[PDB]
Write a protein that binds this ligand. Structure first.
Ligand SMILES: Cc1c2c(n3c1CCN(Cc1ccco1)c1cc(C(N)=O)c(Cl)cc1-3)CC(C)(C)CC2=O
Length: 208
């Protein structure tokens, strides 16, 4: 069963702004994805200190960057804490609503799109380069879910039947036709070196 949900007006407004505003410094999407992955890894690492059984779903704490030219997709995989069904549908929406208002107020005041991360809505920068974003996630206390949106005011949530992840999050970016540069090995390496060189987890860039 595939469940369809409407984004709250502010999120839909944020998504429309990211997709249609003229902004050339699109590369910042990768640092935002890597930062969310890093925070998710920090959370599971901290929780494992008081409860070691939280690592039974996987001991390895890492980030994988997987480009695919045939499918025109860039996948960001982490072995972080993951997200529950409540996180995907309710919990993060509330946070993102206030985050959007403050960000859109800051943009009106002269701030730029690269500052999106400071408002906790950095995830939505994925729409600078992607026409569709798929989020496969597995949290210890819940099942494996697939969140998906091509914007247009709606998102879907379904129980994932694909390859079991153990624990973590997979962000599949179905890239826009003119954004294929983010599939090039030399381009990804350059972005990682410039914006994410001090991330405290191994970042493995897969080759084709
Ligand atoms: C905000 C936001 C949002 C999403 N993420 C965030 C930022 C915080 N966070 C997790 C969190 C904090 C508290 C509870 O859960 C995320 C972690 C990851 C990750 N790599 O583990 C990823 Cl891909 C996206 C998100 C994803 C969404 C599809 C649910 C939409 C959204 O609105």
């Amino acid at each position: 069963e595939v469940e369809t949900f409407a984004f709250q007006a502010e999120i839909a407004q944020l998504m429309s702004l990211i997709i249609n505003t003229f902004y050339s410094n699109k590369e910042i999407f990768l640092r935002e994805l890597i930062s969310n992955s890093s925070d998710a890894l920090d959370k599971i690492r901290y929780e494992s200190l008081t409860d070691p059984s939280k690592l039974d779903s996987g001991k390895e704490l890492h980030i994988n960057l997987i480009p695919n030219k045939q499918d025109r997709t860039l996948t960001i995989v982490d072995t972080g804490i993951g997200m529950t069904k409540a996180d995907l549908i309710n919990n993060l929406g509330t946070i993102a609503k206030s985050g959007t208002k403050a960000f859109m107020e800051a943009l009106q005041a002269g701030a730029d799109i690269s500052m999106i991360g400071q408002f906790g809505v950095g995830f939505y920068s994925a729409y600078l380069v992607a026409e569709k974003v798929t989020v496969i996630t597995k949290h210890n206390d819940d099942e494996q879910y697939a969140w998906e949106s091509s914007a247009g005011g709606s998102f879907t949530v379904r129980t994932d039947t694909g390859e079991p992840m153990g624990r973590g999050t997979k962000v599949i970016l179905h890239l826009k036709e003119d954004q294929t540069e983010y599939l090039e090995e030399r381009r990804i390496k350059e972005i990682v070196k410039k914006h994410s060189q001090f991330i405290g987890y191994p970042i493995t860039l897969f080759v084709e």
